[PDB]
Amino acid sequence: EGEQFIKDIQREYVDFLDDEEDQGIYAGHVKDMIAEKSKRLIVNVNDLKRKNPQRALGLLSNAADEQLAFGRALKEYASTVDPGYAKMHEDLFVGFEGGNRHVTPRSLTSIYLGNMVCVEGIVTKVSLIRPKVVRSVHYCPNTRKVMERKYTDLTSFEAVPYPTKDEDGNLLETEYGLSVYKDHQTLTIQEMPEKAPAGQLPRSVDIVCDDDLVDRCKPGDRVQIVGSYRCLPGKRGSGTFRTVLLANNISLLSKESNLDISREDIMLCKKLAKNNDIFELLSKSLAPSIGHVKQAILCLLLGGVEKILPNGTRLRGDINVLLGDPSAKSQLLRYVLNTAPRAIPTTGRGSSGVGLTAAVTTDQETGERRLEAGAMVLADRGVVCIDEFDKMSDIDRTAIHEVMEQGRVTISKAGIHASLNARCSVLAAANPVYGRYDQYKTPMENIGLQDSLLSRFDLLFVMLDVIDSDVDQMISDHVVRMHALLHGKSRQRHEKILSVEFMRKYIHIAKCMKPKLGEQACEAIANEYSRLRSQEAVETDVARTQPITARTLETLIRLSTAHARARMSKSVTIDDAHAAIELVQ
Amino acid sequence: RRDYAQDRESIKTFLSEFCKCDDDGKKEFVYGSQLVKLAHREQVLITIDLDDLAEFNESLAEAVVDNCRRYTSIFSDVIAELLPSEVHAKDALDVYIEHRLMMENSFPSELMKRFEVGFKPLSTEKAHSIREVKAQHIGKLVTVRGIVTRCTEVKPMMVVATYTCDRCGSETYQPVNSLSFTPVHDCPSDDCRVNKAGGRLYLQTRGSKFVKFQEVKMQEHSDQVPVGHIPRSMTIMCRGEVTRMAQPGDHIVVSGVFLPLMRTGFAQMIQGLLSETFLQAHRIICINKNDEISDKDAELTPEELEELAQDDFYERLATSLAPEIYGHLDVKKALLLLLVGGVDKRPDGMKIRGNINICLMGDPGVAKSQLLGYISRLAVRSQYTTGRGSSGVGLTAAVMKDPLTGEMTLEGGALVLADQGVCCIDEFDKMADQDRTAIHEVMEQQTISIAKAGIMTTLNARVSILAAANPAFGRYNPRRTVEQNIQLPAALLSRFDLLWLIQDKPDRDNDLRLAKHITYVHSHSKQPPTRVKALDMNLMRRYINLCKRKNPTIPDELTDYIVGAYVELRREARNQKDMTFTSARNLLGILRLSTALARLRLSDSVEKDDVAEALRLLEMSKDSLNQ
Amino acid sequence: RSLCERVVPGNRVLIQGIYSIRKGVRAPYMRVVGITVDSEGAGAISRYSNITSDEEEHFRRMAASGDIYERLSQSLAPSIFGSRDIKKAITCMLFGGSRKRLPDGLCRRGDINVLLLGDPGTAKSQLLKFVEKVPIAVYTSGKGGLTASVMKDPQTRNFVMEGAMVLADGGVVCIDEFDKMREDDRVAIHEAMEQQTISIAKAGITTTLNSRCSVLAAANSIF
DNA sequence: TCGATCGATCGAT
DNA sequence: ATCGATCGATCGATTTTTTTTTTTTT
Ligand SMILES: Nc1ncnc2c1ncn2[C@@H]1O[C@H](COP(=O)(O)OP(=O)(O)OP(=O)(O)O)[C@@H](O)[C@H]1O
Numbered sequence A: 001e002g003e004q005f006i007k008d009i010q011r012e013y014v015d016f017l018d019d020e021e022d023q024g025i026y027a028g029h030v031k032d033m034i035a036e037k038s039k040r041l042i043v044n045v046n047d048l049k050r051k052n053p054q055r056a057l058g059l060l061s062n063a064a065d066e067q068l069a070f071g072r073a074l075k076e077y078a079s080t081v082d083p084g085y086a087k088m089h090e091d092l093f094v095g096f097e098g099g100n101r102h103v104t105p106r107s108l109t110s111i112y113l114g115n116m117v118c119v120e121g122i123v124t125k126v127s128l129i130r131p132k133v134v135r136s137v138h139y140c141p142n143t144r145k146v147m148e149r150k151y152t153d154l155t156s157f158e159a160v161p162y163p164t165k166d167e168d169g170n171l172l173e174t175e176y177g178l179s180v181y182k183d184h185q186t187l188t189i190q191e192m193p194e195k196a197p198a199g200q201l202p203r204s205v206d207i208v209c210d211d212d213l214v215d216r217c218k219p220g221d222r223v224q225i226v227g228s229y230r231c232l233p234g235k236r237g238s239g240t241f242r243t244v245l246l247a248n249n250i251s252l253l254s255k256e257s258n259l260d261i262s263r264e265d266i267m268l269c270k271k272l273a274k275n276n277d278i279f280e281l282l283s284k285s286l287a288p289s290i291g292h293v294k295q296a297i298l299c300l301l302l303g304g305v306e307k308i309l310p311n312g313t314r315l316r317g318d319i320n321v322l323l324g325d326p327s328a329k330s331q332l333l334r335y336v337l338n339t340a341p342r343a344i345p346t347t348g349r350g351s352s353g354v355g356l357t358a359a360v361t362t363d364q365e366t367g368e369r370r371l372e373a374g375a376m377v378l379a380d381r382g383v384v385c386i387d388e389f390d391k392m393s394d395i396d397r398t399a400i401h402e403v404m405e406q407g408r409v410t411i412s413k414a415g416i417h418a419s420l421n422a423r424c425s426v427l428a429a430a431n432p433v434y435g436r437y438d439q440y441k442t443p444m445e446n447i448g449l450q451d452s453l454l455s456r457f458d459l460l461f462v463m464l465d466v467i468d469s470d471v472d473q474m475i476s477d478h479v480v481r482m483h484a485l486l487h488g489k490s491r492q493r494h495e496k497i498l499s500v501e502f503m504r505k506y507i508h509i510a511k512c513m514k515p516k517l518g519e520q521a522c523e524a525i526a527n528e529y530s531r532l533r534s535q536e537a538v539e540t541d542v543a544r545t546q547p548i549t550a551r552t553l554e555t556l557i558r559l560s561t562a563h564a565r566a567r568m569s570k571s572v573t574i575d576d577a578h579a580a581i582e583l584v585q
Numbered sequence B: 001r002r003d004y005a006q007d008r009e010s011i012k013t014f015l016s017e018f019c020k021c022d023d024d025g026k027k028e029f030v031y032g033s034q035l036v037k038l039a040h041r042e043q044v045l046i047t048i049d050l051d052d053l054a055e056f057n058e059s060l061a062e063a064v065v066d067n068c069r070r071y072t073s074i075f076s077d078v079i080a081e082l083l084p085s086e087v088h089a090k091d092a093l094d095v096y097i098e099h100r101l102m103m104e105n106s107f108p109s110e111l112m113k114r115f116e117v118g119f120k121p122l123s124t125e126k127a128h129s130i131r132e133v134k135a136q137h138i139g140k141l142v143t144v145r146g147i148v149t150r151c152t153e154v155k156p157m158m159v160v161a162t163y164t165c166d167r168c169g170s171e172t173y174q175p176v177n178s179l180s181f182t183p184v185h186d187c188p189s190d191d192c193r194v195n196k197a198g199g200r201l202y203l204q205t206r207g208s209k210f211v212k213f214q215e216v217k218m219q220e221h222s223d224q225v226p227v228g229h230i231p232r233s234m235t236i237m238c239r240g241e242v243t244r245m246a247q248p249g250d251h252i253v254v255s256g257v258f259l260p261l262m263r264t265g266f267a268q269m270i271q272g273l274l275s276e277t278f279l280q281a282h283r284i285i286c287i288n289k290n291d292e293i294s295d296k297d298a299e300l301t302p303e304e305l306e307e308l309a310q311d312d313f314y315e316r317l318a319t320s321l322a323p324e325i326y327g328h329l330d331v332k333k334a335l336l337l338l339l340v341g342g343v344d345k346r347p348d349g350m351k352i353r354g355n356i357n358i359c360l361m362g363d364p365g366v367a368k369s370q371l372l373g374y375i376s377r378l379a380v381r382s383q384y385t386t387g388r389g390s391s392g393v394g395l396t397a398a399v400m401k402d403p404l405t406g407e408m409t410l411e412g413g414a415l416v417l418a419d420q421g422v423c424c425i426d427e428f429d430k431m432a433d434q435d436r437t438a439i440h441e442v443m444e445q446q447t448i449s450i451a452k453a454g455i456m457t458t459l460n461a462r463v464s465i466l467a468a469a470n471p472a473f474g475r476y477n478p479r480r481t482v483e484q485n486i487q488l489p490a491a492l493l494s495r496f497d498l499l500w501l502i503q504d505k506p507d508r509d510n511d512l513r514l515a516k517h518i519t520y521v522h523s524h525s526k527q528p529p530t531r532v533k534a535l536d537m538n539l540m541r542r543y544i545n546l547c548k549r550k551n552p553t554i555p556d557e558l559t560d561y562i563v564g565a566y567v568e569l570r571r572e573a574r575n576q577k578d579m580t581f582t583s584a585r586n587l588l589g590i591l592r593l594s595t596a597l598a599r600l601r602l603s604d605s606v607e608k609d610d611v612a613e614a615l616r617l618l619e620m621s622k623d624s625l626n627q
Numbered sequence C: 001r002s003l004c005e006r007v008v009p010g011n012r013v014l015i016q017g018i019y020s021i022r023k024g025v026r027a028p029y030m031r032v033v034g035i036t037v038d039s040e041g042a043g044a045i046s047r048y049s050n051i052t053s054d055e056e057e058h059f060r061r062m063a064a065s066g067d068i069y070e071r072l073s074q075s076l077a078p079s080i081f082g083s084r085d086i087k088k089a090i091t092c093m094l095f096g097g098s099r100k101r102l103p104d105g106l107c108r109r110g111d112i113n114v115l116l117l118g119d120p121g122t123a124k125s126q127l128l129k130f131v132e133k134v135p136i137a138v139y140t141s142g143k144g145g146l147t148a149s150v151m152k153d154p155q156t157r158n159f160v161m162e163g164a165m166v167l168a169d170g171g172v173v174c175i176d177e178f179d180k181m182r183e184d185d186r187v188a189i190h191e192a193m194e195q196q197t198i199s200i201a202k203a204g205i206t207t208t209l210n211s212r213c214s215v216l217a218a219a220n221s222i223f
Numbered sequence D: 001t002c003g004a005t006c007g008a009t010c011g012a013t
Numbered sequence E: 001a002t003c004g005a006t007c008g009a010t011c012g013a014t015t016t017t018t019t020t021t022t023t024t025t026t
């Protein structure tokens, strides 16, 4: 027990416990009476300033033991309120939760030391886990007194700290079971970089965590955090200085469950579902800044549908498509990176890690042997885009064949046989070998790659640009329209019924349902596939009818499934058939 | 918190006052039966179940589950000095102790281990997962399921090492339980005390102990991994009398106690108080693909006879393989020939391989990857890889440090382990260029020659091969021929027994057939309705194994005509000048299929109509472009 | 203490420093003892402002002067004759237009880009060297990339990103011989100069950074 | 945990 | 009573490696 003000500080955090606001709400039915047992209470600094400013901004200036005093006061309180759950005799760290100073990883700059502050950056390096060494209820049969000894280190509190031949030489059976342990973790953050000056390199940070907070996202998302600063080691007293962060609660800033989702928003969705001609709207929703597809790109944004059998096998449910000369195909994929979740562009020139790892490690603090990640499992249960496809090498393509079609990734990097679950889709971009060409010579052989992929993909297709002398003034009219609010109220609309946010919020239920097939798809699909393989190869189109297989069925069923999710009609109809199939023809 | 005295009496009372009468004829002592079984020197480890301790008491029915390390040692010294019932010179350790006292610092009873105890929870409590062992599983005997990986072999661990000065004849007791230690100085005795009469004591394993000490690696199920995560692992130290209780590829269920670990060493990287833990266990009940769920640890005749005479057909076993589509009937039965085989002998010293290896050619939509992915599941000890899914060392052996010894041994790839079965490969052409020699080598069976160290790289692979690849741009162009449309090594194409190409031209009424075939795979989860009773996979597993053990003779009465069959074979393909190749190994092949086909007869009655199917089988295996 | 983010790389410096060691073969280094900068015309005038109201005054008084553009079409060459319509938009290329992002995706192309090809003997090289000379820019020509820099510091064995269209993110770039450099390194630059989202996907990183650069192209046609 | 450092101590002289 | 040799308590000093991604030339 150091300086006597520490205990004034204990009672001053007790001085939060006056009346209904905290003596009523914040303590009691809060974790253990409600029996969630997530030890960390929820603090908000603003109320602290509104009660005790010297104890509010004493915290965001120093945190020597104010956390520990918060915890001491909490156990003193709950021991009175409900001692039954007072059996977790540890520190019980708490929130400090809640724009005073929110500088970047680039600007955690030689100050804020001894402060508790805010950071933003990239979810990255979702990394390895270990447990922690606390205190152990030793024992000696010769004397039969179960003594104790607590162990510390700097990353938990200030001070720094197994017994053998303790008293004079008597027995020591180190009793585990009543010896306790936290959970421990280490990972990092990177600046969300597009605030960068690209004359400079976006900088980095270092963060450490603790028990009931562990490993709460995947590397490749965006996040907020609010934590404190510590710096232990030698610094020419022996060699310079380093950083680390703690004292925080987690904040991911890309979810929907973050939204207060009551039974009313679903009610608006299901009310408006009855409106039939909404598909043509949602097609004209996605790309309000560009003619031109997206009726189906939507279905690609709906993942797919998974179908298994008893103790047999399983299938992949999702769709993959693409078709075009230069000049709005290399600007229609950024409707995915920043429209919808888990979207990762790739290069068109990048090797050795689309799904590879290289597994390289170099004498880790612990025994990290061999592993790195890839660029598909990041996109599990969603989507991928690429630009400049055809110029990709012919190396990693076959990995795409495998992991697309088989719907599982069961690979090895020469050290370890590996298996996982990556069940995603992908796009890319397109370029013919000879520039401005798809029509006079042939439709095919203007693309130049294996005819195996169109089975792996779905579509042999076409995309071009010009017009003759009559409609050229009509494209002039549309181009000048592209080059306000008038007459997009002739487009009977609202910026809340057609938007980005509500459009995103129609994810949850369309992906939670399982709109089973009835029966009346069957004769239609069969007769149509018959006509398809029969007479698609005549009248100027014989050579553009090669890639048909018995794979248009799984695509058709993917399509009617997806279209059955955009209005949640727990059934499937002929109108869904038309709206799903007219693309193929 | 609790006491070591009345608790001791309670557990002794449990040891004695125990005639748990679960049913009729149970009026004696179960643990007293186990006691006299110790008295037999037959049993050396009792297994314990909560039901006994469920009915006796409640503390130690919940007090031992969290500690597991004290009440067991009390159980140890409790029973160690309980002699209710020789011979002396029967056990190597005990006979060495009786050597050493017949020859004659107190000896522990820990030295005379001579018997052990484990546990067996009640209701494999639940399938707790290697991920979810969070910050409350220290010391607690938890039940969990994992997946095996990279097993090594039995090693003897040490517990007590004794020296002897050779000047005072001292028999010291230096017990050890951790990994590392140091012995004692020259004379830690009283006759060899500070008095100058001291020499230097020296170890003797004779009056010392060793213990079974196995180690394996433990990998995850890859069914409950998080959505955006990667498979993890954990380590095993399975002690006691359970070494050799797992194999690579057993979905095991292990029950033991989590514990921490102190990798003593450098005080900076280590000594950081970070707890690089490890596992401990006693009981390995592998619930998937082990001695429990697989019987015969298939030859058991009586239990299957009721179904054996219950049915009599072959095609019933035919289309029961991947029964979710229709079509390609003649492929599945011959594939089923691949699972059985069974033609083994040592005629003239030369051994004949009986593993069929066939490929799949032509893929404008055929479900090529379906048969492979299915049969690799149903076929016990199967694998699956693709063209650029693995390098040459991924297929062949490799090297890695060894936690058991560190010997830097060789570990093999997919084909290295799939012997005595079938290793499946898909999309063969784009596998690799040098890989074709790698598959050229298996045609001289049990011969995997590598140049990794390039010394010998000898290895006995007795695998089949399930090949499958695609044609290049096009599918038998009107002018193209074999080795023209395909760009595979024709020598490699030579070394197969059945070539298999799957080409589907438009059939105006077969498409609707399959459309109604596969669409019913999705409204429900079972294709064949009310037309035949397709068999369960599990009964399939034994029904295939029983056929193998026959090994019939050959009918000389048809040997006179098998050669004539080869005559018409080699002639009706020879009637044209430039048809595809017809090989002289056909007579060595036709003999190898009719045998395995008779294996499912289990009769040694290969008949004239027996090969009558094989003749049309190879007959259609070629000439697949006539119409 | 206060002079990080005082110098971006790619600049001309004056320096006041000191040459002192850290540990007879022992090591060198130097620090700042009160840095300042250069005046190669405006040697360091690249991010900050010690320009004064006098400078703004002179500037904007030049601006309204409606005989400045035809004045500036004769600015680059105090030694070359003619070629004025070629020159009326080698100077606008510096100035750039507008990088207008919108509520949808369309971050439309900000800068502009240049072409020229012609028989030798018309002073191509000096002109492009002059456009390099006169805010920030760099110059190569052919033989250089399609790959970016995923190397590894032999210290710690990781895959860092050293990153040089990066170095024109407000500057520009000029090259000659798009012709005589073959196609293995033209595709990354196919991409960069239409979206500026320079992507990376090699190993376990997908940090599609970006850089806003323009570009100038000389050429040589056969015969 | 290993090595020389240094200071003390026990018979000789 | 002076001095050298041996014993022994006291002090401080050591413990980072196997794949990959560009690059020049056959
Ligand atoms: N209908 C349209 N919708 C959206 N943008 C358009 C449209 N028409 C023209 N544009 C604009 O014109 C430019 C077209 O270039 P774009 O990015 O499509 O090339 P690209 O298709 O990527 O080239 P490549 O396919 O060869 O890589 C873009 O900046 C785009 O914003």
Ligand SMILES: Nc1ncnc2c1ncn2[C@@H]1O[C@H](COP(=O)(O)OP(=O)(O)OP(=O)(O)O)[C@@H](O)[C@H]1O
Binding pocket: C079, C080, C081, C118, C119, C120, C121, C122, C123, C124, C125, C126, C219, C220
């Ligand atoms: N129009 C001109 N007026 C004055 N001097 C000129 C003119 N054209 C060229 N010169 C002189 O010739 C030189 C310019 O030649 P330059 O290097 O441009 O040829 P180039 O364009 O590089 O030829 P190539 O394109 O074949 O390499 C200058 O040094 C200049 O002194």
Ligand SMILES: Nc1ncnc2c1ncn2[C@@H]1O[C@H](COP(=O)(O)OP(=O)(O)O)[C@@H](O)[C@H]1O
Binding pocket: A405, A455, A550, A551, B324, B325, B326, B327, B363, B365, B366, B367, B368, B369, B370, B426, B470, B514, B518
């Ligand atoms: N008649 C059919 N019955 C069942 N499935 C079929 C049928 N026709 C096609 N399919 C589908 O076609 C797919 C073919 O994939 P596959 O040919 O194995 O790929 P690859 O050509 O790369 O081997 C199968 O996964 C299956 O789902």
